Design a protein around this ligand. Structure first.
Ligand SMILES: CC#CCOc1ccc(S(=O)(=O)N[C@H](Cc2c[nH]c3ccc(C)cc23)C(=O)O)cc1
Ligand SMILES: [Zn+2]
Length: 254
């Protein structure tokens, strides 16, 4: 039916050079494969533990920004060669970066269920990504489905159906299996999931119980059985969002 959230996938010049080897083919295939692996997790998840399954993601359009964005003095762009505010770090403040991407990609984002940015930046405090949390409410801007949000400062309409993933952490490239989980997790927020309560052991098992689920606030290793699965807490939240938003912007799988 309408069980697929089409994506606008964007790779900046950093991801192109460091993850893609300066090759459009390589960068492109990497993203295509990663999204498909993430899609397997979503598609096989039974949100109602019964029959509400088969919902996933699929790339609608891929954009590879081979080189940085020629910028002028006092202006900033998410694909600009240098980082903001501290260029020396070559890693933006993740929050400002997600907002900038949303501002600059507004036009295209209005045409897709979700827009996701892939970069290669070593964000402070082991941060690997960020994304706006979705909601079942139609007038709630964040997450799945485009809903114009007038940005007082931006002086224009933007869409908060976005998120980003970085495959660099502590000076090195993270593992492929870790990359898959960062994106699953960020898309998870987009799909309506909040962080698993570090209290309710039902949603945050001990290592001898299979480990944490993908939406735990501290990045899982991906070594354990539960690491690439959504908890009950996440299933309930995402089910709620999907139930109403799927009718809103989900399409059929191509
Ligand atoms: C591998 C793996 C498993 O998935 C991940 C687990 C943790 C990270 S992180 O540590 O980089 N943290 C981000 C950003 C964030 C901080 N406080 C927040 C409060 C609310 C919201 C909605 C986002 C954030 C996240 O949780 O998405 C990234 C991926
Ligand atoms: Zn999170």
């Amino acid at each position: 039916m309408k069980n697929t959230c089409k994506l606008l996938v964007v790779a900046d010049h950093r991801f192109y050079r460091y993850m893609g080897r300066g090759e459009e083919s390589t960068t492109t295939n990497y993203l295509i494969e990663l999204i498909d692996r993430v899609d397997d997790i979503y598609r096989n998840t039974a949100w109602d533990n019964a029959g509400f399954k088969g919902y996933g993601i699929q790339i609608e359009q891929i954009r590879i920004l081979k080189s940085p964005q020629e910028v002028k003095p006092g202006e900033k762009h998410y694909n600009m060669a240098k980082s903001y505010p501290n260029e020396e770090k070559d890693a933006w403040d993740v929050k400002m970066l997600l907002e900038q991407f949303s501002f600059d990609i507004a036009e295209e984002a209005s045409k897709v269920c979700l827009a996701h940015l892939f970069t290669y930046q070593d964000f402070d405090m082991g941060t690997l990504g960020l994304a706006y949390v979705g909601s079942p409410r139609a007038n709630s801007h964040g997450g799945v489905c485009p809903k114009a949000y007038y940005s007082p400062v931006g002086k224009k309409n933007i869409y908060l159906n976005s998120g980003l993933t970085s495959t660099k952490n502590y000076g090195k490239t993270i593992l492929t299996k870790e990359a898959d989980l960062v994106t699953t997790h960020e898309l998870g927020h987009n799909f309506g999931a909040e962080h698993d309560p570090d209290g309710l052991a039902e949603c945050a098992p001990n290592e001898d119980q299979g480990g944490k689920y993908v939406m735990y606030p501290i990045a899982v290793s991906g070594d354990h059985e539960n690491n690439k699965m959504f908890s009950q807490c996440s299933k309930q939240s995402i089910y709620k969002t999907i139930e109403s938003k799927a009718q809103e912007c989900f399409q059929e799988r191509s």
